[PDB]
């Protein structure tokens, strides 16, 4: 089923989201992403690598971060996102614009420390919730800001009467 | 800030730019002609005043009378040039007024779009005028010209429609008429004379843009001079007009010279499709010269509109019920637009357009609760059918049900 | 006052609510008009999730707003 | 917008006043007129002098000098003015009309209409002209307007007598007489298939107008209501289809131009030929004509060959989607939107119909 993939990619394109295909494959590509305003991830700019399997509607897409982001449920050596909705609670109803605009900010605004993917991030989150913001700002600065995204990616006579 | 999602005024200006491109061409032609003739007349007056000054050298009575005669001639010439300038100014003002009226029209649109039930009606009226302009332009573009026995002025259905609808200044309707006249002369009358006159009038622009139209016209004339055997006239026309084209094209000239006594190289040369190929060349050159759009705008608008609202399910007592359905007023379902509807593609909908509170009946149809109740009340009041209290009736598949057998539905 | 809610699919729903109405009541109304149980149902206004305890008057409304309907998400 | 202001400010330079009455060439005309004036004056002076000659040497020298001094002034002033006209024209063109050539409308024209369907484009135009612009025609009495339409506009479509009668009765109503409209409404009331509430309201409006600044608004309301009621009663289109189609085409223009950019920027392929790729948003009075259902899982319209089916708890999905989720009616599954399991107890093909 390529119709669903094509429609989702077109829906992503027709908005302000910046989408770049790789070798025009139409099943794997990159999407630009901007941090949500309220959270400390406010000025950060990131790039996501997504890959859609051939059986896309009933198989979850593979999404990762090619930049560096600090988060308990997000890897540091890579950007392997891990949350249930994508992994085990995926219904053939969500879309790419939907998935980004709903559950990327959703995961950014609700970390879970029961079984995290980043151990040091979990330890920091459980200990202090005031210097975590300055850390995240810090790491964002060293790895992903606008500049980093730009770099890595006479006499006049008299008068005689006249005839009509 | 659009009312019903309509584009801004700048897009309207960009959308039909021929309306501003054609009057400018007429203005440029007027200015060029005036400049050339007035320079020539100035030179003539200069030589006149040199001769008169020479006449004044000899202080004699006879020479003085000759000088007075020369001054009289000068006055006559200046009166002539004054009349010419008056005519030119009279022609100038009308072409300026055309653009004035178009600008006022679009300014009225902008004023309407800068002020909602009361405002919507004004926009609808403005778009009615817009579609009238488009329809009139289409009708003027392609409709046979009917000659007038009185005043000998050409007229068409588009021209009379524009004159009667008070949209006179918004469409030129005369350069389009000239194009139609020349094109129909080429296609049907086979006259070929108006095209030659047009080429002669507009020879410099054709040479500057290096369009192969004068040579093609002369070649067609030469061929037409051999279908009926007039060998001396054919030879003299060849030597007078076809010769100066040796440098530009030589193989065609050699083939034309070979065509002097009447081999698949000749069916194309004597075929009738050459009349059209001269029409296509002339029309392309004319539209490039004036700026007229290569296609009829109304056709573009229809092509977009038909595919923009074509759905999948769009072609597949009793009288009132049949008229009660709301799917019998689709603008693209009508018997007039059916073949075009079949030709054009479908539409892309990303959301489901439906009604508010659906309920499903045992037969297998989903209706709207409030509308169904209102229909039942209307049927009961006018006595189209007798019903038990607390019952509903479905329009298609004539049947009656109770309110206890309707199941809620949740479209998504 | 009538307010609009936009769902994941895209469908927009208008509904009547009073400033004294609790968010549980809004969830019940959405349950009635959609059929999705209120427990797995969250609202989002100005990028902030809304809790059941607080009522509609706690968050300012201009009598014509655009809430967002959202499902449940959790990491692991 | 701003571009229209640019046109309006650059156009005013053609005239020489704020009232937009006098062009630039009038300077040429006045210069030539003045030139002729002093030519006439100097010739009459020559004659006064000749007749006297039958002191004067200088009197002749002034004439000789002036007669060549005026011609030079006329030449200088005239060439200057026509140059300034030409320079102004070229400046206006370059600075104003070169901002429009970026958009070529002809590039949008794909999926061209077949050449064999011009008999329908010329038939819808006739209907539109009959519906809207019939009052301006000098039709006069009936049975000659037929010849007028057939000879001038070439209109020979079926819905002609109804529109002619409609125009005649509307013109009569415009004079204040309400006998015709009342008789027609009373005649239409007899049948058992007419909208009685609308006819009753129209009769009440006619009664109020018959009893009677305020009249003009009532007259317009009664006229519009009669138009709507008659068009509904005679089974004809209140709004001509061509107008609605053109109004849709405008919006389609606005979105297409954008899609082609996203096409040049990122190269994408749309493999479904019969459906145009992008999406267009239409106003309220141009959408709800047919029931359109978009499947949540496949995001595709629902067709008679792909009927919609209702699950266990009354959600609606496609037919092939239900076949794929529950493979050929073998296993069960839950809704893609709520945790309620579904089996082959799913109801039959649900049919959406607009009431
Ligand atoms: Zn239809
Ligand atoms: Zn369900």
Swiss-Prot record, chain A:
Top-level lineage group: Eukaryota
Pathway(s) where this gene product acts: Protein modification; protein ubiquitination
Pfam families: UQ_con
Reaction(s) catalysed (UniProt annotation): S-ubiquitinyl-[E1 ubiquitin-activating enzyme]-L-cysteine + [E2 ubiquitin-conjugating enzyme]-L-cysteine = [E1 ubiquitin-activating enzyme]-L-cysteine + S-ubiquitinyl-[E2 ubiquitin-conjugating enzyme]-L-cysteine
Cellular component terms per the entry's GO annotation: cytoplasm; mitochondrion; nucleus
Keyword entries, A-Z: ATP-binding, Cytoplasm, Nucleotide-binding, Transferase, Ubl conjugation pathway
Gene Ontology BP terms: mitochondrial outer membrane translocase complex assembly; negative regulation of gluconeogenesis; proteasome-mediated ubiquitin-dependent protein catabolic process; protein polyubiquitination; ubiquitin-dependent protein catabolic process
Sequence similarity: Belongs to the ubiquitin-conjugating enzyme family.
Name this protein carries in UniProt: Ubiquitin-conjugating enzyme E2-24 kDa
Native source species: Saccharomyces cerevisiae (strain ATCC 204508 / S288c) (Baker's yeast)
Organism lineage string: Eukaryota, Fungi, Dikarya, Ascomycota, Saccharomycotina
Curated annotation (Swiss-Prot), chain B:
Pathway in which the depicted protein is active: Protein modification; protein ubiquitination
ZnF region ranges: RING-Gid-type: 330-397
Record's keyword annotation contains Transferase: yes
Gene Ontology terms describing biological process: negative regulation of apoptotic process; negative regulation of gluconeogenesis; proteasome-mediated ubiquitin-dependent protein catabolic process; protein ubiquitination
UniProt keyword annotations, A-Z: Cytoplasm, Metal-binding, Nucleus, Transferase, Ubl conjugation pathway, Zinc, Zinc-finger
Matching PROSITE patterns: CTLH, ZF_RING_GID
Catalyzed reactions: S-ubiquitinyl-[E2 ubiquitin-conjugating enzyme]-L-cysteine + [acceptor protein]-L-lysine = [E2 ubiquitin-conjugating enzyme]-L-cysteine + N(6)-ubiquitinyl-[acceptor protein]-L-lysine
EC number(s) reported in the record: 2.3.2.27
Record's subcellular location: Cytoplasm; Nucleus
Gene Ontology MF terms in the entry: ubiquitin protein ligase activity; zinc ion binding
Highest taxon of source: Eukaryota
Keyword Nucleotidyltransferase among record annotations: no
CTLH domain: residues covered: 175-233
Function field: Component of the GID E3 ligase complex recruiting N termini and catalyzing ubiquitination of proteins targeted for degradation. GID E3 is regulated through assembly with interchangeable N-degron-binding substrate receptors induced by distinct environmental perturbations. Required for the adaptation to the presence of glucose in the growth medium; mediates in association with the substrate receptor VID24/GID4 the degradation of enzymes involved in gluconeogenesis when cells are shifted to glucose-containing medium.
Recorded family membership: Belongs to the FYV10 family.
Additional information: Present with 784 molecules/cell in log phase SD medium.
Descriptive protein name: GID complex subunit 9
Swiss-Prot record, chain C:
Effect after changing residue 75 to R/Q: No effect on ubiquitination by CRL2(KLHDC3) E3 ligase complex. Impairs ubiquitination by CRL2(KLHDC10) E3 ligase complex
Phenotype when changing residue 74 to G: No effect on ADP-ribosylation
Effect on the protein of changing residue 65 to D: Phosphomimetic mutant that binds and activates PRKN
UniProt signal peptide: none
Protein location: Cytoplasm; Nucleus; Mitochondrion outer membrane
Chain positions of site Essential for function: 68
Maturation and modification: Phosphorylated at Ser-65 by PINK1 during mitophagy. Phosphorylated ubiquitin specifically binds and activates parkin (PRKN), triggering mitophagy. Phosphorylation does not affect E1-mediated E2 charging of ubiquitin but affects discharging of E2 enzymes to form polyubiquitin chains. It also affects deubiquitination by deubiquitinase enzymes such as USP30. Mono-ADP-ribosylated at the C-terminus by PARP9, a component of the PPAR9-DTX3L complex. ADP-ribosylation requires processing by E1 and E2 enzymes and prevents ubiquitin conjugation to substrates such as histones.
Residue numbers bearing the ADP-ribosylglycine modification: 76
PTM-bearing positions, type (Microbial infection) ADP-ribosylthreonine: 66
Cross-link (Glycyl lysine isopeptide (Gly-Lys) (interchain with K-? in acceptor proteins)): 76
Start and end residues of each Ubiquitin-like domain: 1-76
Consequence the record notes for mutating residue 66 to A: Abolishes CteC-catalyzed ADP-ribosylation
Name recorded for this polypeptide: Ubiquitin
Classification of source organism: Eukaryota, Metazoa, Chordata, Craniata, Vertebrata
Gene, per the UniProt record: UBC
Section of the entire sequence shown: 1 to 76 of 685
From Swiss-Prot, chain D:
Protein name according to UniProt: E3 ubiquitin-protein ligase RMD5
UniProt xrefs under PROSITE patterns: CTLH, ZF_RING_GID
One GO MF term attached to the UniProt entry: zinc ion binding
Pathway(s) it belongs to: Protein modification; protein ubiquitination
Assembly notes: Identified in the GID/CTLH complex. In the absence of stress, the complex exists as an inactive anticipatory complex (GID(Ant)), composed of VID30/GID1, the E3 ubiquitin-ligase RMD5/GID2, VID28/GID5, GID8, and the RING-like subunit FYV10/GID9, awaiting a substrate receptor to form the active E3 ligase complex. When cells are shifted to glucose-containing medium, the substrate receptor VID24/GID4 is induced and becomes part of the complex, named GID(SR4).
Catalyses which reaction(s): S-ubiquitinyl-[E2 ubiquitin-conjugating enzyme]-L-cysteine + [acceptor protein]-L-lysine = [E2 ubiquitin-conjugating enzyme]-L-cysteine + N(6)-ubiquitinyl-[acceptor protein]-L-lysine
Gene: RMD5
CDD domains found in the cross-reference section: dRING_Rmd5p-like
Subcellular location: Cytoplasm
GO cellular component, one term: peroxisome
Main location per the UniProt record: cytoplasm
Domain (CTLH): residue spans on this chain: 162-212
Assigned EC number: 2.3.2.27
This protein's UniProt keywords: Cytoplasm, Metal-binding, Transferase, Ubl conjugation pathway, Zinc, Zinc-finger
Protein family per UniProt: Belongs to the RMD5/GID2 family.
GO-annotated biological processes: negative regulation of gluconeogenesis; proteasome-mediated ubiquitin-dependent protein catabolic process; protein ubiquitination; ubiquitin-dependent protein catabolic process
InterPro entries the record matches: CTLH/CRA (IPR024964), CTLH_C (IPR006595), Fyv10_fam (IPR045098), Rmd5_dRing (IPR037683), ZF_RING_GID (IPR044063), Znf_RING/FYVE/PHD (IPR013083)
Record field: transmembrane: none
